A paper describes a structure:
C7 symmetry expansion followed by focused classification and refinement of the peripheral region yielded two distinct classes with improved density. The two classes are referred to as either ‘up’ or ‘down’ based on the orientation of two cytoplasmic helices that extend from the transmembrane domain (TMD). In our dataset, protomers favored the up over the down class, with approximately 72 and 16% of the symmetry expanded particles assigned to each class, respectively. The molecular model of FLYC1 was initially built from the best-resolved of the two classes, the up class, which was the primary subject of our structural analysis unless otherwise stated. In the up conformation, the TM4-TM5 linker is parallel to the membrane plane, while in the down conformation, the linker swivels towards the cytosol. In the up state, the cytosolic extension of TM4 interacts with the β-domain of the cytoplasmic cage through a salt bridge between R334 and D598 (2.9 Å distance). To test this, we disrupted the R334–D598 salt bridge by either mutating the arginine to glutamate or mutating the aspartate to lysine and determined its effect on channel kinetics. Effectively, the deactivation time constant of the channel was approximately 40-fold slower than WT (WT: 0.477 ± 0.285 s (N = 6); R334E: 18.5 ± 5.2 s (N = 6)). The striking 40-fold delay in deactivation kinetics upon disruption of the up state-specific R334–D598 interaction suggests that the formation of this salt bridge in the WT protein is associated with channel closure and that losing this interaction is important for the stability of the open state.
Flycatcher1 (FLYC1), a MscS homolog, has recently been identified as a candidate mechanosensitive (MS) ion channel involved in Venus flytrap prey recognition.
Numbering used by the authors: 186 to 203, 222 to 242, 264 to 285, 290 to 354, 507 to 751
Write the structure that this text describes.
């Protein structure tokens, strides 16, 4: 309740009106004055507030063996807190920077449409539901590629808190040296035993944030398996297979694989292999090449004009193996579209063989009947 905060402010004012105790009350009150001064923001406000409190306390302030020591305790506790706030602020800034690397521009058009719609809803308002439902869909689409960062933040924070506890224990002088030595000794033993798990976690972090072979929604190829990335985390990546089975891969194994990424690929190519009889006249082979050229040229929304036909080999004297190399106008992120276009090309090849009378026969077999 703002009223309670205001009451506390009033109480502090009363303490001053009725001076170190009042100054202390002003700090104890956790006054919103810093927020007003500030009207990353809240990490900055805390940092400033702590800094002011420390400076005030030191300026505000016989029994060196008995009570003076409490002043040392307080001095250093406040300092530890300020160190903590500082590191906290640094952490936040760096993680925000990291997160920006996960912004995807694939949503640029959706973002611009949403900005326009929300701008007009501020003045022409009095369709609207679609705008808000699309806004929600976009916010989730963008937040889905930042889940690894949120996880890293939790991990880093836990480490940071522990580091600050240790700093407090040391800087205030509360810890003694025999316990510090036993503490460090046990930590080394723990590292010895569980260090290998930490190595794995760290390597997974490098894979996800530095190597970064894929993002969410990309269609990737791993060990010949074409899979869509559903989500990314620090320890695991979740993929959908072509039949939509959900598959969980340890990042520790993906870190050692060659990963294809269709989303990021340039227009991809393809191959149609076939065979014809050895006796097919070279003239029909020439006609086949011309017919194919015309087909591809009549369908430039699907095919680039560059293609090659390669004659590979003569098997016995019966078969000629050939292959047609073509180039699609798309990459293979939309796999179904790729197959539909290829399917039409295969049927065109069928048609050409029929029209040009291209066949394949089996070698003849000689029979001798004994009776
Ligand atoms: C804080 C240390 C925990 C030990 C595991 C190291 C990774 C930090 C925890 C982040 C979650 C990793 C991904 C698991 C899947 C999920 O979160 O749903």
């Amino acid at each position: 309740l703002m009223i309670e905060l205001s009451v506390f402010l009033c109480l502090l004012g009363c303490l001053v009106c009725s001076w170190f105790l009042l100054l202390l009350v002003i700090f104890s009150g956790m006054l919103i004055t810093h927020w007003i001064v500030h009207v990353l923001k809240t990490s900055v406000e805390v940092f400033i507030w702590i800094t002011v409190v420390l400076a005030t306390w030191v300026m505000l302030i016989n029994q060196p063996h008995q009570t003076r020591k409490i002043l040392e305790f307080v001095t250093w506790t406040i300092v530890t807190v300020l160190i903590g706030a500082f590191l906290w602020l640094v952490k936040t800034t760096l993680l925000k920077i990291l997160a920006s690397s996960f912004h995807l521009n694939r949503f640029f058009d959706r973002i611009q449409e949403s900005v326009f719609h929300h701008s007009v809803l501020q003045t022409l308002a009095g369709w609207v539901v679609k705008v808000y439902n699309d806004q929600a869909a976009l916010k989730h689409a963008l937040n889905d590629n930042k889940t690894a960062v949120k996880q890293l933040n939790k991990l880093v924070t836990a480490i940071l808190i522990v580091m600050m506890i240790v700093i407090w224990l040391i800087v205030t002088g509360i810890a003694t040296t025999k316990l510090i030595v036993l503490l460090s000794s046990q930590l080394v033993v723990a590292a010895f035993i569980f260090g290998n798990t930490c190595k794995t976690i760290f390597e997974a972090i490098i894979f996800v944030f530095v190597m970064h072979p894929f993002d969410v929604g990309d269609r990737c190829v791993i060990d010949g398996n074409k899979m869509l990335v559903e989500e990314m985390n620090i320890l695991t990546t979740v993929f959908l297979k072509w039949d939509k089975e959900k598959v969980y891969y340890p990042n520790s194994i993906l870190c050692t694989k060659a990963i294809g990424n269709f989303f990021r690929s340039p227009d991809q190519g393809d191959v149609l292999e076939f065979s014809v009889d050895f006796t097919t006249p070279v003239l029909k082979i020439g006609d086949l090449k011309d017919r194919i050229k015309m087909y591809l040229e009549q369908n430039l929304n699907f095919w680039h004009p560059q293609h090659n036909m390669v004659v590979k080999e003569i098997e016995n004297v019966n078969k000629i193996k050939m292959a047609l190399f073509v180039n699609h106008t798309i990459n293979f992120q939309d796999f179904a579209e790729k197959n539909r276009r290829r399917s039409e090309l295969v049927l065109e090849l069928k048609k050409i063989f029929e029209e040009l009378d291209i066949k394949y026969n089996l070698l003849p077999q000689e029979i001798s009947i004994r009776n």
